[PDB]
């Protein structure tokens, strides 16, 4: 059986515009030239993110009815480049006329018709402005780069937005307002317009109010006007218009095009405007959100809870002992991003893994979406998640529930209940509670759903599955066969996954008494119009369930008999455990509650840190698939290293070591590590040096210099292909060492930015930039990174390591003649010459509103490359320019933003939204801060670094903090600033605290990986080396008499911590009271820990396994 494509049955077209709409009515794809207009498809249940709503206001009510999509059930007529809508709400007629002009420019025309007292209107569009590939890819991101002007025109507010994001080399643009009418009130956000409310009410929350007038550059990019409020008896009439221009260099200055407005609004079609048949929902009800538990409901299905998070003494989150953490109905509708989880099978964690299945869910009844079999973006069944308030609720697997003589969609439960094996929803009904359970299997590719009523009654269903079977809804056919109570589901010829993986397939065993169809059965005369809707009709039944299998390789396995989520649970606990080598903290006394929160979190930690090494993607940053070659290098290899998966670690290396590219013999930004050969050629200054560290770290780790003759090939640069000319890795080595000797300025030892260095958003905006800045840090790093590689090979290849080691001196020498003045680090050099030399992120810089950077100082400290003095300095500045509650900043002050367009920075001088990066608390780089800090053995601050970024109960320790999902990494931390120029204006309200943060993006990330090598290795001190363990912690105070349980070297030992600043000697370790011998560790800011060789140390955990740790901190 072939499943049909969806094509949207309705299409404008006009000059060089085409605007296609689903048969209610419904934005589809508006394109002009090759620029969308909207941000999201709509879909056939739902409809489209866009409206028109006519209100009215009574003495006693306020009513509100949209006037345009399926939702309104109007009447509609059609033209090659003209759309009529008709109806009726309460006793007021309309028409809406939608007009596609040849000049880039609609109209939305509205009639009314009756007589009322008090109505208005207001215009709804969520917009896009870039090209389809940026915003399919992610509707977000593309947000973040749509900065919007505000202007008042002839007829009230008019917004004017700039894609300041290049799209094809173009600057996008669009321009909307009214005519005939005054638009008294605006807003800019998809947040300001539905409000998080709607994630249970499915109300646009600004429809009982007035719109804010507010510009709020957040990423849910979404205009909405309110017009005047008027009198009606008779017919009055006025239009919506908008402009769109594929390219706007210049920033916004005031209202553009009133002329070209003018001709197009007289522009109408000669054509026959003839009747279509519209499909009509059919016994389907508003979503269904359960009521929300109170005390004793929470006290009866949770009886033990840990780490309990109240606001206004309402519950919103805790923890459970079976290491779950539960959050309530309420916490979801304060934060601003959803609640949701990531599912990914276990795997041989002694080689990179393959074919790994994934699935992801939220809070608000997405129960399986991007479902996966390895590749994350091409081996896909279910469709992604988009957006953020669930407005479109459609993807992947949802669930309908008939209540009375209507289908309900879940939505919003009382409870979801997160654990690393799966997730569980508890909705609330009329004397029954319904749990949702997905979960993974463990050492089995697949996902199962499963649907239980808990007071065994029955209930007819409808399950949806929005399918993909490739990367992208709506792009192939799908090839569907079943045998009895098993669906099988495969790539049709054209889609790419065919030709990579040509056996993969997916099966679904579905229940024994259940109906298949398509969308056509939500819709009163049968129609289908998504054909590749999947939907299952489940009839009386109190429970059921759904198995999903991933092949991709064509290995398929017979279903099970029973699934089991309880075992699935126990059998993850322990993979778990014994990933993060059994760490638990405890003491006989009240453990401190930074050791409780570490005990609740590690394994979180640890499980976004597995998704971002082994089925890379996130919760926003749902388009992932590839390893990030800094990436990998950092999260998983850190990671790893401090837990002695070092097998692992040899196999990644050698994987990495297979992608370095041929001719340039640098490495690609990111490169798929599967059979898709696909790359991104172009890479940064800084990402050659760390497959050099790593590998490096992973020699002194391992002794394992056996990696350096092991023979890797290399990878085409446009291709992606092997070049089937291997070499050794050691001579990969040379080879990228070689680029960066050819990275000097002339006449020096510093290292060129090149791409640019760490922060993705500091690309150089121009050639000269990019030959003759140099960035402190990437010298720092380089002068680390050459230094390692030099002790790496000093035992194999004496010339090469001695030549290491000169130009490690060089470079060293360069970065302490140029880089340090008055004390002070610059963030970067720019040098035309020695006669022409000036610093940038440097007080000297007094032309610029930027003077220090963070980078530098924390780099330099962490390779101990910063001599005493200057370490202590480097500390200073942080503290005095840097430092926040939320935790230490990038800059001290924000990066220019005059309308978007860059002068020395990309992305940094072109995001309106003041997030990610931009935010300046990217919580990758306060990790680092830590790391430097227990370089210097700072433990007081080390310990409060940690956990100004631990999520959980971090509002109760960051005051300003505003609270987020507490079981997740969040990769930044940015004021609540509308835009970028209140944010420049009052960031000093940052460092005070007298503005709220607020949490970025979720779970991928490097940071996972990073932390959790922070906790356990720099600051409770256990690190391992080549037949050896260093034991050099830097603790805290609060740490006394509490124990750490961890396994080293395949045995399970108790380190228990004694901080006695009275002691003669550093460190002192003891078992049975006999005194470990070892030798001192080298650190140039402090005595260093103590190195005990591995025979030693395990011969005395045999006898007795209770280490004592004597520390003076
Ligand atoms: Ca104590």
Same mark, same amino acid.
């Given at each position: ?155 009230? +507010? ?82 919506? +218009? ?272 259940? #109906? ?28 059921? *369930? ?25 059998? +993850? ?73 070092? *097998? ?64 890797? *090939? ?24 070689? #680029? ?77 003649? +140029? ?227 961890? #396994? ?46 591995? *025979? ?18």
């Amino acid at each position: 059986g072939i499943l049909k494509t969806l094509s949207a049955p309705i299409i404008l077209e006009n000059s060089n515009s085409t605007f296609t709409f689903l048969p209610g009515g419904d934005n589809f794809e508006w394109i002009h030239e090759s620029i969308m207009i909207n941000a999201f498809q709509g879909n056939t249940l739902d409809g489209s993110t866009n409206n028109l709503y006519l209100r009215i206001y009574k003495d006693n009510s306020l009513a509100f009815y949209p006037l345009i999509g399926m939702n309104s059930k109007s009447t509609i007529k059609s033209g090659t480049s003209t759309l009529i809508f008709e109806g009726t709400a309460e006793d007021i007629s309309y028409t809406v006329t939608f007009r596609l002009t040849p000049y880039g420019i609609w109209f939305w025309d509205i009639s009314l018709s009756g007589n009322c007292n008090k109505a208005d209107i207001i215009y709804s569009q969520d917009i896009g402005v870039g090209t389809k590939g940026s915003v399919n890819s992610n509707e977000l991101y593309l947000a973040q780069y749509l900065g919007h002007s505000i202007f008042q025109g002839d007829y009230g +507010y008019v917004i004017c937005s700039r894609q300041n994001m290049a799209q094809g080399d173009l600057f996008p643009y669009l321009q909307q307002g009214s005519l005939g009418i005054r638009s008294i009130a605006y807003s800019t956000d998809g947040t300001q317009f539905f409000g998080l409310s709607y994630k249970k009410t499915n109300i646009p929350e600004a429809l009982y109010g007035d719109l804010p007038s507010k510009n709020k550059q957040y990423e849910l990019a979404h205009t909405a006007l309110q017009t005047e409020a008027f009198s009606l008896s008779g017919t009055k009439q006025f239009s919506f +218009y908008g402009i769109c221009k594929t390219n706007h260099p210049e920033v916004i200055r005031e209202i553009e095009y009133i002329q070209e407005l003018e001709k197009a609004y007289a522009y109408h079609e000669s054509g026959e405007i003839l009747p279509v048949n519209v499909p009509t929902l059919q016994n389907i009800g508003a979503p269904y959100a359960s009521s929300r538990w109170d005390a004793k409901q929470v006290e009866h299905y949770f009886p033990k809870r840990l780490l309990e998070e109240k606001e206004e003494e309402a519950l919103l989150s805790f923890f459970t002992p079976e290491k779950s953490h539960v959050v309530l109905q309420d916490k979801e509708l304060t934060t601003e991003r959803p609640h949701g989880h990531i599912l990914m099978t276990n795997f041989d964690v002694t080689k990179v893994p393959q074919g790994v299945v994934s699935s992801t869910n939220y809070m608000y009844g997405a129960f399986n979406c991007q479902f996966v079999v390895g590749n994350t973006t091409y081996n896909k069944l279910l469709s992604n998640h988009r957006g953020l308030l669930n407005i479109q609720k459609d993807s992947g697997q949802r669930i309908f529930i008939k209540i009375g003589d209507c289908y309900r969609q879940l939505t919003l439960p009382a409870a979801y209940e997160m654990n690393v094996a799966g997730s569980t929803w508890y909705y609330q009904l009329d004397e029954d509670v319904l749990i949702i359970t997905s979960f993974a299997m463990y050492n089995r590719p697949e996902i199962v759903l499963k649907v239980q009523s808990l007071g065994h009654k029955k209930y007819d269903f409808i399950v949806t599955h929005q399918l993909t079977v490739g990367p992208n809804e709506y792009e192939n056919e799908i090839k569907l066969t079943r045998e009895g109570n098993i669906l099988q589901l495969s790539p049709t010829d054209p889609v790419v996954t065919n030709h990579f993986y040509p056996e993969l397939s997916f099966r679904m065993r579905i229940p024994e008494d259940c #109906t298949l169809s398509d969308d056509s059965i939500f819709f009163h005369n049968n129609t289908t119009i998504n054909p590749s809707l999947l939907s299952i009709e489940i009839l009386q039944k109190s429970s059921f *369930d759904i198995v999903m299998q991933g092949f991709d390789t064509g290995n398929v396995i017979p279903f099970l008999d029973q699934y089991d989520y309880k075992e699935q649970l126990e059998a +993850y606990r322990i993979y778990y455990d014994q990933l993060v080598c059994n760490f638990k903290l405890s003491a006989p006394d009240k453990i401190p509650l930074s050791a409780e929160k570490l005990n609740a979190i590690i394994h979180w930690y640890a499980h976004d840190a597995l998704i971002h090494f082994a089925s890379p993607h996130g919760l926003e940053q749902s388009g992932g698939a590839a390893w990030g070659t800094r990436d990998v290098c950092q999260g998983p290899i850190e990671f790893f290293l401090t837990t002695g998966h070092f *097998d692992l670690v040899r196999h990644i290396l050698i994987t990495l070591y297979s992608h370095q590219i041929e001719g340039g013999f640098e490495w690609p930004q990111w490169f798929m590590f599967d059979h898709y050969p696909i790359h991104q050629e172009d890479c940064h200054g800084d990402v050659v040096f760390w497959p050099l560290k790593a590998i490096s770290d992973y020699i002194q780790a391992t002794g394992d210099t056996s990696i350096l003759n092991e023979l890797v *090939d290399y990878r085409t640069a446009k291709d992606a292909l092997p070049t089937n000319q291997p070499e050794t890795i050691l001579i990969h080595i040379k080879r990228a060492v070689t #680029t960066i000797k050819n990275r000097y300025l002339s006449g020096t030892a510093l290292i060129s930015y090149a791409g640019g260095d760490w922060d993705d958003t500091l690309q150089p905006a121009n050639s000269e930039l990019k030959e003759n800045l140099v960035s402190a840090w990437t010298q720092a790093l380089a002068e680390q990174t050459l230094e390692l590689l030099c002790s790496a090979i000093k035992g194999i290849d004496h010339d090469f390591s001695k030549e290491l080691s000169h130009m490690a001196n060089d470079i060293r020498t360069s970065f302490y003649q +140029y880089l340090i003045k008055d004390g002070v680090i610059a963030g970067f050099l720019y040098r035309e010459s020695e006669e022409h030399m000036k610093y940038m992120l440097h007080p000297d810089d007094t032309e610029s509103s930027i003077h220090y950077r963070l980078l530098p100082l924390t780099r330099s400290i962490i390779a101990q490359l910063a001599d005493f003095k200057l370490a202590t300095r480097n500390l200073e500045i942080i503290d005095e320019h840097l430092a926040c509650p939320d935790g230490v900043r990038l800059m001290d002050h924000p990066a220019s933003y005059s309308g978007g367009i860059s002068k020395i920075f990309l992305r940094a001088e072109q995001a309106a939204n003041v997030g990610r990066e931009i935010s300046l608390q990217y919580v990758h780089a306060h990790i680092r801060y830590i790391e430097a800090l227990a370089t210097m053995g700072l433990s007081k601050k080390a310990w409060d670094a940690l956990m100004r970024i631990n999520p959980i109960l971090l509002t109760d320790y960051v005051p300003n903090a505003l609270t987020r999902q507490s079981n997740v990494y969040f990769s930044s931390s940015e004021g609540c600033f509308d835009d970028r120029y209140e944010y420049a204006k009052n960031f000093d309200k940052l460092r005070t605290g007298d503005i709220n943060v607020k949490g970025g993006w979720r779970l991928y990330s490097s940071g996972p990986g990073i932390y959790i090598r922070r906790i356990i290795a720099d600051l409770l001190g256990i690190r391992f080396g080549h037949n050896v363990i260093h034991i050099d912690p830097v603790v805290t105070k609060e740490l006394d008499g509490v124990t750490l349980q961890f #396994t080293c070297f395949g045995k399970t030992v108790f380190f228990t911590y004694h901080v006695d600043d009275t002691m003669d000697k550093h460190i002192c370790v003891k078992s049975n009271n006999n005194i470990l011998p070892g030798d001192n560790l080298n650190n140039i800011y402090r005595d260093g820990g103590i190195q005990i060789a591995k *025979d030693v140390f395990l011969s005395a955990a045999m006898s007795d396994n209770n280490f004592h740790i004597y520390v003076k901190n």
